[PDB]
Design a protein around this ligand. Structure first.
Ligand SMILES: [Mg+2]
Lengths: 320, 56, 103, 43, 102, 93, 56, 389, 49
RNA sequence: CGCCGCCAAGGUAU
């Protein structure tokens, strides 16, 4: 009798099969190669380390940060990765020699997040004072500084199709920018509690937003409120979305929640227990990412642990 | 018999020599000789005991 | 010496009431004879308001008579256990009840 | 029987709080050292 | 039309801001270049890699002494290798506190 | 010399005085302490005279310093002998 | 010159014991000019090495 | 310092809620061995020192000069050590007043206040520094200045209780190597008779001393009125900047008489390790004592195959000799519990390149199995609750 | 969803905030949940006898 | 078979 009730697509559930816990300091971000070999992560240990995806072994670690690492990403066109954190430094970690070659600097405050353009050699970075900034690779000069916010900007994404830059900030607004002129295209005001997670899908339009109160959904041209989701009332940090229609939201109380793209239906409502050293309430999901096959999910939580989920080859998980 | 301690005494003796040299901001062998060191307090000086001139 | 007369004790009470708890040099700067450590000793010995310096009871005595037999020494170990917490009133109770059991 | 203080089993084990079906790793050691690259270019 | 101090308004030819690494190394075909990304399955390869990686681990001397035999070394064995991230109770902290101080 | 890790001081200081100015400031500080404690406790009978000594007014008693007054809250309880004055003020309880 | 990354070599006691005791037939000591001539059978573990000219 | 002091109050908290780590019979048997040792040695107990003691000032002046030696520089502290030297010079001007004040502290006072701790930054070495209030420092200084001379007068200590009053290179070669070369048939090498030394440390010997068992042990040799005083001074509230934590199980060693406690605990650990018969062979009868390693009736020397022993403060040194069948039986008794051979790439000289390889220890299988076997054989008859090796 | 005032030892801020109550600022400043173990007795009299 | 060669900010307030 409910609207859009008979038509969700049946996603098989996710289950634990290995955990990765080697850090000494809060692990913060997860990135993965497009070549399905390993995945890179940073921590408050000031030691970025990569982990093999299949075997789980530690491939190598490397240090050099003065403060914690709040973002890490690897490029697809180029054989090197980028990292950033609260030491006011964005480091360009070469992978042919495991060293820093660029050492971006110019931010007047700390650095929260970063993102790459999939086609061209530019980079976007969201910081703590009020701004997001464009870093030009091969020049390491700030082309545009995006100054329209009144608080810190939590996450940032950019793509090839217009509009380019999506910045969700701690002054409870999102805005979508123009990468050419530097002025903003559209500002988006909802979410009484501030927005901390946006993501591209990447197949078709309708990107999503993330906030503690009534998590929403948007559109690429002209802006359009498509749908709001159910009562996921925890304070959240991360969103990750798959092309076949399943989505995952990672929060601060340890509760991570699955969704679907066809309807907006909460499927599993799974909670992660603590590995022995942690206390009763320390678990908070600060990173989550799929594989490039999107057959494996893996999260980095506030218990200094990466938990890895696979599928479940059963059938009796039907939607009521 | 212990050669590694005879090396350590030569390493640390010239190191405290250099520490007294940088207090004068001189660091010179010819301007600031070891005659300044190896002289007793009764005639004046600092007064130290040589183990670097032992031909390790 | 440390005679610890009441005219300095009430001043120390007012100094603990105004300034704080782990704030000892600033309140021993106004006594002309005492340092911080002796003021700490008396305030954790006599001037704390949770100290039950009187009203000896029956249950705590029968608690300590088979607690001073578990350990013959270590009266400061059993001082948070009893709740008398002065660590010298337990010694007075012990020698007084051993004088009453001998007479 | 009394337990000693120099081991002092303060916590439930990860295997008995996560189940025997999952894997746990206590990896704090690096193979493949800093000289050995990851890309291994055409040379 | 009136940019910041970095563009035109300054002659501060500052250190750490130089044309260093003015060429970009491109990921060629023997690595995981996107031309080989747009057609590979990514799913069977990870499955066979994890299946290949899962199989990698396959008298008349002391008759007067008091304690004749304690019969236990650790009372089970000495192989635990567990992980407690509470930094006061970690075994690395236990070795730190039993080695350096005495 | 280690100019950064030495016990330092500011120029033109003058230092700190002898015992006389130190315990003068100590007695003035204890005076301010006693006045603020009677301000919190709200005692209307504490009175200072024309020579820097303390007086209990219902007591009509002298006190040479601060702790002489602020130990006089337990002995010769005339504060309960003002019950007769309260009975004169009001014939019922 | 100053040495490079290959400062400390490490071989445990039983292996270099079975390799080297006072056992080799020595007639003359192997000089350093023999190794600078060619460091391949008189010296072990080479790297960052260049190879010189012989008999113009 | 914050980390070690919070770990110390955590282990003092975990001793109470978990009970004693020592078992009941584990302590009763130690007490029985000590009373058998004291009835064998006929060591009459230390009486209480009277007020009319004969050589009474002659120890108090020693204790006061021992305290006065540590004050030569006069860039000193504001109150505590200046009133320390003030109490020392008041004891100088009136010896009898401080002499009876020690007795006033010594009969009825067993609840003592804050002492302070600092650490020495000796760069991969740290010793704590416990500075105690001087009103207790004069008392326990006169206490151990009485107790050491009183214990060695009626020979409480066997000659292996070291460092004693000769010199330590006599302890090292000229009574030790001169001890081992003068033995009967030192090397024989034709019947499998071999010499072998062990050197170990009593790890955490200081902290793992329960004060109840300690008080019940040292009231046998010392009068109980000051034995309770000694085992009541061993716990105070350890003072720091913000952490005022008390003590219950581990003794603090910044006091004067704590060295006597350490050496008596070492002696009772020796008679747990060496037993009662071999120690009676080594130290001999009370009517005719022995030297450091000199023995009587050298046929007795050939028996009980461990040859000779010394105990530095927390470090024991054993020279011991085996024949063929005894060492074979000891190795085959060790190998019943330990499978998986050739696991001996750790023992002895593998990283210590201080000697050449012909001078270093070669790792032959029989010798390294004998070494690990006698390490196990000294690893037992020494339970984990008192010390560990 | 409110907060009590701060009863800190070092504050160096707005108000040190002394009421008549809020003095110990803990449960009892020290607690062991049983305060003793009975095996002490299994030691103690076992030595005594 | 033969190291090593020293300036300044750190203090006489703004
Ligand atoms: Mg200054």
């Amino acid at each position: 009798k409910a609207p859009t009730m008979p038509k969700p697509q049946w996603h098989p559930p996710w289950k634990l099969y290995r955990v990765i816990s080697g850090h000494l300091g809060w692990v913060r971000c997860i990135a993965v190669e497009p070549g399905n070999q390993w995945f890179v992560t940073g921590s408050a240990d000031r030691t970025i380390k990569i982990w093999d995806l299949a075997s789980g072994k530690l491939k190598l670690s490397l240090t050099g940060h003065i403060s914690t690492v709040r973002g890490v990403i690897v490029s697809t066109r180029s054989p090197y990765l980028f990292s950033c954190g609260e030491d006011k430094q964005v480091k360009c970690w070469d992978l042919e020699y495991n060293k820093v070659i660029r050492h971006y600097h110019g931010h007047l405050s700390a650095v929260y997040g970063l993102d790459l353009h999939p086609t061209i050699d530019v980079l976007v970075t969201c910081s703590r004072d009020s701004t997001a900034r464009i870093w030009d690779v091969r020049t390491k000069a700030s082309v545009h500084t995006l100054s329209g916010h009144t608080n810190a900007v939590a996450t940032v994404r950019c793509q090839a199709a217009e509009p380019q830059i999506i910045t969700g900030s701690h002054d409870t607004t999102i805005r979508l920018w123009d990468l050419v002129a530097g002025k903003t295209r559209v500002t988006l005001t909802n979410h009484k509690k501030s927005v901390r997670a946006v993501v591209l899908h990447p197949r078709h339009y309708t990107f999503a937003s993330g906030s503690p109160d009534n998590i929403k959904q948007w559109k690429f041209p002209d802006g359009s409120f498509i749908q709001n989701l159910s009562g996921h009332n925890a304070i959240i940090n991360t969103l990750t979305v798959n092309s076949d229609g399943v989505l995952v939201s990672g929060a601060d109380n340890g509760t991570m929640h699955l969704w679907d793209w066809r309807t907006g239906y909460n499927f599993q409502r799974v909670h992660a227990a603590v590995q022995p050293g942690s206390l009763d309430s320390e678990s908070g999901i600060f990173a989550c990412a799929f594989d490039q096959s999107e057959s494996r999910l893996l999260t980095a939580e506030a218990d200094k642990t990466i938990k890895v989920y696979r599928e479940d080859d059963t059938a009796t998980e039907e939607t009521h | 018999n212990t050669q590694e301690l005879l090396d350590l005494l030569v390493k640390c003796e010239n190191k405290i020599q250099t520490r007294i040299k940088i207090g004068l901001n001189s660091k010179m062998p010819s301007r600031f000789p070891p005659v300044v060191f190896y002289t007793p307090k009764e005639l004046g000086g600092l007064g130290m005991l040589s183990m670097g001139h032992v031909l390790i | 010496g440390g005679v610890w007369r009441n005219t300095e004790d009430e001043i120390l009470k007012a100094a603990v009431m105004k300034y704080g708890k782990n704030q000892w040099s600033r309140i021993a700067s106004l006594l002309h004879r005492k340092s911080a450590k002796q003021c700490k000793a008396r305030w954790y010995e006599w001037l704390d308001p949770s100290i039950k310096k009187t009203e000896w009871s029956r249950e705590e005595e029968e608690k300590l008579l088979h607690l001073a037999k578990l350990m013959p020494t270590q009266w400061r170990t059993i001082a948070p256990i009893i709740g008398r917490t002065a660590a010298q009133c337990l010694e007075h109770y012990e020698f007084l009840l051993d004088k009453a059991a001998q007479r | 029987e009394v337990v000693l203080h120099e081991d002092k089993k303060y916590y439930p084990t990860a295997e008995e709080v996560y189940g025997p079906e999952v894997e746990t790793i206590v990896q704090e050691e690096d193979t493949q050292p800093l000289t050995e690259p990851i890309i291994k270019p055409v040379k | 039309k009136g940019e910041g101090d970095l563009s035109q308004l300054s002659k501060q030819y500052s250190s750490r801001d130089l044309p260093s690494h003015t060429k970009i190394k491109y990921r060629q075909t023997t690595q995981d270049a996107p031309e080989e990304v747009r057609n590979r399955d990514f799913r069977r390869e990870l499955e066979e890699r994890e299946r290949a990686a899962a199989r990698e681990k396959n008298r008349r001397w002391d008759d007067d002494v008091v304690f004749k035999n304690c019969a236990k070394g650790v009372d089970d064995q000495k192989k635990d290798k567990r992980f407690v991230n509470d930094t006061l109770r970690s075994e690395f902290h236990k070795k730190f506190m039993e080695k350096y101080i005495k | 010399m280690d100019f950064q890790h030495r016990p330092g001081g500011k120029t033109g200081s003058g230092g700190v005085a002898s015992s006389s100015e130190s315990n003068r400031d100590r007695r003035e500080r204890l005076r301010q302490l006693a006045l603020e404690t009677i301000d919190i406790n709200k005692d209307p009978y504490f009175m200072k005279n024309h020579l820097g000594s303390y007086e209990c007014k219902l007591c009509l008693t002298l006190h040479n310093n601060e702790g002489s007054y602020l130990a006089h809250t337990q002995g010769k309880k005339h504060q309960t002998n003002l019950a007769r004055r309260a009975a004169k003020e009001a014939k019922e309880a | 010159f100053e040495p490079l990354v290959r400062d400390i070599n490490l071989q445990d006691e039983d292996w270099n014991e079975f390799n080297d005791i006072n056992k080799i037939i020595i007639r003359q000591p192997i000089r350093t000019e023999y190794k600078i001539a060619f460091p391949y059978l008189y010296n072990n573990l080479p790297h960052h090495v260049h190879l010189t000219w012989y008999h113009t | 310092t914050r980390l070690y002091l919070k770990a110390e109050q955590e282990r003092q908290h975990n001793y109470l809620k978990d009970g004693p780590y020592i078992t009941a019979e584990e302590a009763v048997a130690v007490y029985t061995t000590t009373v058998h040792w004291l009835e064998s040695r006929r060591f009459s107990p230390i009486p209480f020192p009277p007020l009319s003691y004969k050589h009474d000032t002659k120890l108090l002046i020693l204790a006061l000069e021992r305290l006065k030696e540590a004050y030569s520089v006069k860039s000193r502290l504001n109150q505590s050590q200046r009133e320390e030297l003030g109490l020392i010079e008041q004891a100088y001007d009136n010896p009898h007043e401080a002499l009876s004040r020690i007795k006033r502290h010594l009969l009825t006072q067993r609840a003592f206040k804050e002492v302070g701790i600092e650490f020495m930054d000796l760069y991969s070495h740290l010793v704590p520094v416990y500075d105690v209030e001087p009103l207790e420092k004069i008392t326990d200084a006169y206490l151990d200045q009485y107790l050491w001379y009183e214990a060695d007068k009626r020979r409480l200590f066997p000659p292996w209780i070291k460092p004693a009053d000769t010199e330590p290179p006599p302890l090292l070669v000229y009574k030790w190597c001169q001890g081992i070369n003068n033995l009967q048939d030192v090397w024989e090498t034709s019947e499998g008779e071999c010499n072998v030394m062990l050197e170990s440390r009593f790890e955490k010997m200081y902290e793992k001393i329960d004060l109840t068992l300690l008080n019940r042990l040292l009231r046998l040799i010392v009068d109980h009125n000051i034995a309770d005083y000694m085992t009541a001074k061993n716990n105070v509230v350890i003072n720091y900047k913000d952490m005022n934590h008390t003590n219950s199980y581990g003794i603090i060693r910044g006091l004067q008489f704590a060295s006597f406690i350490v050496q008596y605990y070492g002696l009772v650990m020796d008679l747990l390790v060496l037993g009662l018969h071999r120690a009676s062979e080594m130290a001999g009868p009370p009517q005719m004592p022995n030297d450091f390693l000199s023995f009587q009736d050298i046929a007795t020397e050939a028996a009980h195959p461990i040859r000779l022993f010394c105990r530095y403060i927390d470090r024991i040194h054993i020279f011991f000799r085996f024949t063929a069948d005894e060492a074979r039986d000891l190795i085959q008794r060790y190998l019943t519990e330990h499978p998986d051979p050739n696991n001996e790439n750790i023992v002895g000289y593998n990283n210590k390149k201080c000697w050449p390889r012909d001078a270093r220890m070669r790792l032959m299988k029989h010798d390294v199995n004998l070494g690990r076997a006698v390490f196990w054989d000294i690893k037992n008859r020494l339970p984990r609750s008192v010390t560990t090796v | 969803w409110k907060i009590p005032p701060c009863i800190s030892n070092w504050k160096n801020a707005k108000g040190y905030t002394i009421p008549l109550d809020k003095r110990l600022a803990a449960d009892g400043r020290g607690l062991q949940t049983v305060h003793i173990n009975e095996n002490f007795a299994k030691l103690a009299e076992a030595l005594y006898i």
